[PDB]
Design a protein around this ligand. Structure first.
Ligand code: CA
Ligand code: CA
Length: 158
């Protein structure tokens, strides 16, 4: 049933919540359907630069991705550091586009911050270097501070 694979590049966290004394040990957990993926832990850093790829199998245009940040405590429970979700459908519908041969830098669809989504700023779906890309800044919900910067890429699966 597979449509393809979505690469979620988790770039970094910005000003993440402090869940130890003075810092945190954040890792990101991403869920979609029954799939559950996580980045590595970055030690003692509220602006962790993960630059890390998570790969999800996609069977559905109508699916939502959930992202949760936790602070790893080796010898105890891990505290919540906020969560956000986002839609992939706009990305997916832009893939089915007749896109090929547009100038690099070309902005194709734009998703706007709403009371209902987690975007800290409008999300540009861009056609660069022969690939369709979506960049996101997600404002974490349920926490006193924190943002996560991610980028979507698509992998065809023959
Ligand atoms: Ca802790
Ligand atoms: Ca910790």
């Amino acid at each position: 049933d597979l449509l393809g694979l979505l690469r979620i590049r988790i770039k970094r966290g910005v000003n993440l919540a402090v869940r130890d004394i003075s810092s945190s040990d954040p890792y990101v957990v991403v869920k979609m359907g029954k799939q559950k993926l996580k980045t590595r832990v970055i030690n003692k850093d509220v602006n962790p630069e993960w630059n890390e790829d998570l790969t999800l199998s996609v069977t559905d245009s109508n699916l939502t991705v959930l992202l949760t940040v936790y602070d790893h405590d080796m010898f105890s429970k891990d505290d919540k550091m906020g969560d956000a979700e986002f839609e992939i459908s706009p990305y997916i519908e832009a893939l089915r586009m007749q896109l090929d041969g547009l100038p690099s830098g070309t902005i194709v669809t734009t998703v706007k911050p709403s009371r209902r989504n987690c975007l800290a700023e409008e999300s540009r779906v861009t056609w660069v270097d022969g690939k369709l890309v979506q960049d996101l800044v997600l404002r974490l919900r349920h926490v006193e501070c924190g943002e996560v910067e991610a980028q979507l890429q698509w992998i065809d699966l023959p």
